[PDB]
């Protein structure tokens, strides 16, 4: 839970995996997507009008 | 990543394939297929020279397509500045569109005249002020030559058709521009291309890393973002029982 | 009498170097268009036993022993002799390194004509010289046709 | 004299692995185009 | 426009700026003189307009 | 941003941004020859207002 900062240099060897972790995040979010019940669907609620 | 970036890359491929040389096609395809590259790595990959490289790189700088990066490790790298590139493309297509539209508008006008002795064109109004006393034809002021009409009236439909078919050819670029305007663009940097480094070689001389400087304020343009088998088992247990006995 | 002169000038197989013997053997393999058996070697170099030379010839990647029969076959640079295989190779490319026509002629001597007709098909990215259209390093046509926009429109574009 | 100079080259680079062209030329006294096409066929 | 190795550019533009500076004036701080054939230096516009019968 | 200290020299202009904003004293003056192009651009980026103040 730390905001990234360009003042921090990090470790280059570990931070090469940054975009790999990013595309892992994208793939995982893709996996995590699922249809929602209309009884609680705020997307349907905001798509009322 | 985002498919709109992929559309941008394929747009660049289509644009160069339709408007530039094969060498430009190869260079831009290679540097998109890879990332920021050193010059000697390009010479290794394409087996080329600085003599051949010069005009192509110069033209790519002229169209503001690929920003050139230099750093000391001096090692020279190259990356496509996306917003400056698309703004240059938009400006060029806008200029082409306005140019050809005004060409068609001007070609819809009366063609005019010329005096072929002095090889000087004459407008319709210049013909009007240069008429004879007979109110029939027009005589030149210097060569005193009867004015002969310009030949562009049949060219009006030809330029219209060239405009139409050129718009048809350029239409995928227009659609990609529309999708780009739908999208929101993040500006390319050298270190951004470093984050998407695509190494061609395992023997490249260049250290494709960014090494920043402290105590420096150097500002420059182009950088701006404001059973049997059971037995052996039981014999295995026989060995283990004997092994635990001595222990 | 020419045959007698050639027989007198025929250097014995006991050359100064086993490398020279193996070089002449690789010449004999390359000049034959078929996988030649070990008896062909026993014909060419007049010795019978398995040698360090024969063992290193087996160890050669370009010279492949046949465990089934013994037919030593020359192994080329590329096992591509069809444009379908050539396009599959080009699509299977991992970097933008081009490929010379010479080692492609090795194994596939009728590859240059195929390259020419593929370029006329605009299915490749060939490199040709300026003296003449002499094909060189090639790449896969990742995009559409190279001959895309007509010459007058490209001309007025260059005017732009 | 292809085969003789071929074996002779093998002793020569055995004498010195960085054998130069000029050192090769004085060790041959032969047609140079014939000399150059022999050298690259085996080594540098 | 052709291959620019970025080490002729600087002196080429310096020469261009030098020569237009010379054409404007040849009475500058004495690092150049910029004479033509023959040994008489080229007169620039300041030399044409200076005192004692230069145009004024 | 920080400004240099311009040294007039020859027929061109060099800068020196001491800028004093390192982790230390920043004793790195950017000895950079200012391009005529960038001077032109930054002169294009002046106010009318500012012209009148400067006497243009």
| Other residues' Cβ atoms within 10 Å of the Cβ of residue B234 | 8
**A18 vs B contacts (CB less than 8 Å):** 195
Closest residue on chain C to D10 (Cα): C17
For residue C129, what are the CA distances in angstroms to B25, C134, E10, E24, E32?
17, 5, 34, 49, 48
Q: How far apart are CA B122 and CA B145, in angstroms?
A: 12
Q: What pairing do the DSSP bridges indicate for beta strands B113-115 and C135-140?
A: unpaired
Q: What DSSP designation does C36 have?
A: B
Q: How far apart are CA A17 and CA B108, in angstroms?
A: 62
Q: What DSSP designation does C53 have?
A: H
Cβ contact A23–B1 (<8 Å)? yes
**B169 vs C contacts (CB less than 8 Å):** 148-149, 153
When scoring C9, C12, C13, C20 by the number of chain D Cβ atoms within 10 A, the one with the most, hence best to mutate, is C20
Neighbours of chain C (3+ CB pairs under 8 A): B, D
Cβ contact F27–B215 (<8 Å)? yes
CB E11 within 8 A of CB E4: no
**Dihedral in degrees, nearest 10, Cα atoms D31, D32, D33, D36:** 130
Neighbours of chain A (3+ CB pairs under 8 A): B
Burial tier of B89 (Cβ tally within 10 Å: 0-12, 13-18, 19+): buried
Q: Does B1 touch chain A (CB under 8 A)?
A: yes
| Other residues' Cβ atoms within 10 Å of the Cβ of residue B41 | 20
Q: How far apart are CA C96 and CA A15, in angstroms?
A: 27
CB E25 within 8 A of CB E17: no
| Token output for C103 | 């080692």
Burial tier of B193 (Cβ tally within 10 Å: 0-12, 13-18, 19+): buried
Distance from the Cα of B194 to chain A's closest Cα (Å) equals: 10
DSSP codes, B214-244: SS-----TTS----HHHHHHHHHHHHHHHHH
When scoring F11, F12, F13, F40 by the number of chain E Cβ atoms within 10 A, the one with the most, hence best to mutate, is F11
DSSP H helical segments within B109-154, as ranges?
124-129
> Could you tell me the maximum CA-CA distance found in chain C, to the nearest angstrom?
76
End-to-end CA distance of chain E: 44
Q: Which residues contact B186 (CB under 8 A, 6 or more apart)?
A: B82, B192
Task: With both helix axes pointing from N to C terminus, report the angle between B3-19 and B82-108 in degrees, rounded to the nearest 10.
Answer: 50
Task: Give the three-state DSSP class for C20.
Answer: helix
Task: Give the three-state DSSP class for B78.
Answer: strand
Q: Please indicate the experimental technique that yielded this structure.
A: cryo-EM
Q: How far apart are CA B36 and CA B79, in angstroms?
A: 5
Closest residue on chain B to F15 (Cα): B218
DSSP H helical segments within chain B, as ranges?
3-19, 22-33, 39-46, 50-62, 82-108, 124-129, 155-182, 190-195, 228-246
| Other residues' Cβ atoms within 10 Å of the Cβ of residue C73 | 15
Cis amide linkage into residue E38, ω under 30° from 0:
yes
Q: Which residues contact C41 (CB under 8 A, 6 or more apart)?
A: C25, C54, C57, C72
CB B127 within 8 A of CB B147: yes
Q: In chain F, which ranges are E strands?
A: 7-9, 12-14
CB F34 within 8 A of CB F7: no
Residues of C with CB under 8 A from a CB of D: 11, 15-17, 19-20, 23
Nearest to C104 by CA among C122, C86, C117: C86
F34 backbone dihedrals φ, ψ, rounded to 5°: -75, 130
**E18 vs F contacts (CB less than 8 Å):** 11
At what resolution in Å was this solved?
A: 3.7
SS (H, E, C) C83-152: HHHHHHHHHCCCCCCCCCCHHHHCCCCCCHHHHHHHHHCCCEEEEECCCCCCEEEEEECCCCCCCCCCHH
CA angle centred on B149, ends B145 and B150, rounded to 5°: 120
SS (H, E, C) D1-44: CHHHHHHHHHHHHHHCCCCCHHHHHHCCCCCHHHHHHHHCCCCC
Q: Which residue has the tokens 């247990």?
A: B237
Q: Check chain B for breaks (C–N over 2.5 Å) and list the residue before each, or none.
A: 73, 226
Query: b/e map of C117-139 (b: 16 or more CB within 10 Å)?
Result: ebbeebbbbbbeeeeeeebebbb
**F24 vs B contacts (CB less than 8 Å):** 215
CB B198 within 8 A of CB B32: no
């Amino acid at each position: 839970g730390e905001k990234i900062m360009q003042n921090d240099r990090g470790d280059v060897i570990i931070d090469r995996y940054l975009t790999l972790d990013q595309e892992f995040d994208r793939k995982d979010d893709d996996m995590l997507l699922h249809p929602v019940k209309k009884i609680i669907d705020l997307d349907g609620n905001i798509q009322d009008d | 990543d985002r498919p709109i970036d992929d559309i941008v890359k394929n747009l660049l491929k289509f644009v160069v394939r339709g408007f530039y040389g094969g060498s430009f096609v190869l260079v831009l395809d290679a540097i998109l297929f890879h990332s920021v590259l050193a010059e000697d790595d390009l010479k290794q990959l394409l087996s080329i020279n600085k003599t051949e490289l010069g005009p192509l790189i110069a033209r790519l700088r002229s169209d503001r397509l690929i920003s050139i990066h230099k750093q000391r490790e001096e090692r020279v790298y190259y990356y496509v500045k996306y917003p400056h590139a698309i703004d240059a493309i938009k400006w060029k297509v806008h200029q082409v569109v306005q140019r050809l539209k005004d060409d068609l508008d001007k070609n819809s006008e009366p063609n005019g005249y010329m005096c072929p002795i002095c090889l000087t064109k004459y407008t319709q109004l210049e013909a009007v002020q240069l008429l004879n006393f007979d109110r029939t034809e027009f005589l030149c002021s210097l060569c005193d030559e009867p004015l002969v009409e310009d030949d562009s009236g049949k060219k009006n439909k030809e330029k219209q058709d060239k405009l139409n078919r050129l718009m048809d050819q350029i239409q995928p670029i227009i659609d990609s521009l529309k999708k780009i305007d739908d999208s929101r663009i993040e500006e390319n940097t050298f270190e951004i291309a470093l984050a998407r480094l695509i190494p061609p070689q395992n023997q490249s001389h260049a250290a494709y890393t960014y090494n920043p400087k402290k105590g420096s304020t150097m500002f420059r343009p182009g950088d701006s973002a404001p059973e049997e088998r059971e037995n052996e088992k039981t014999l295995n247990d026989y060995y283990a029982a004997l092994a635990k006995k001595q222990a | 009498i020419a045959a007698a002169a050639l027989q007198a000038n025929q250097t014995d197989i006991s050359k100064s170097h086993d490398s020279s013997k193996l070089l002449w053997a690789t010449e004999y393999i390359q000049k034959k268009g078929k996988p030649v058996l070990v008896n062909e070697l026993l014909d060419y170099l007049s010795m019978k036993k398995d040698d360090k030379v024969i063992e290193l010839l087996k160890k050669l990647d370009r010279i492949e022993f046949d465990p089934k029969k013994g037919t030593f076959k020359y192994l080329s640079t590329y096992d591509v002799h069809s444009p379908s295989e050539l396009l599959k190779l080009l699509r299977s490319q991992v970097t933008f390194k081009g490929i010379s026509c010479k080692d492609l002629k090795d194994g596939w001597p009728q590859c240059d004509e195929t390259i020419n007709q593929l370029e006329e098909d605009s299915k490749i990215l060939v490199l040709r010289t300026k003296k003449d259209k002499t094909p060189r390093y090639v790449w896969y046509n990742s995009g559409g046709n190279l001959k895309c926009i007509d010459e007058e429109f490209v001309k007025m574009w260059e005017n732009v | 004299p292809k085969k003789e100079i071929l074996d002779y080259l093998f002793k020569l680079f055995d004498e010195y692995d960085y054998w130069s062209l000029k050192g090769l030329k004085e060790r041959t006294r032969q047609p140079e185009a014939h000399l150059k096409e022999c050298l690259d066929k085996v080594a540098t | 426009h052709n291959g620019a190795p970025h080490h002729a550019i600087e002196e080429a533009e310096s020469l261009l700026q030098f020569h237009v500076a010379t054409y404007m004036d040849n009475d500058i701080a004495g690092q150049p003189q910029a004479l033509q054939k023959s040994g008489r230096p080229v007169k620039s516009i300041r030399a044409r307009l200076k005192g004692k019968e230069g145009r004024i | 941003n920080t400004q240099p200290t311009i040294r007039k020299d020859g027929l061109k202009l060099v800068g020196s941004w001491k800028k004093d904003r390192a982790t230390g004293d920043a004793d790195e003056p950017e000895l950079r020859v200012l391009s005529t192009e960038e001077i032109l651009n930054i002169f294009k980026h002046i106010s009318v207002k500012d012209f009148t103040s400067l006497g243009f």
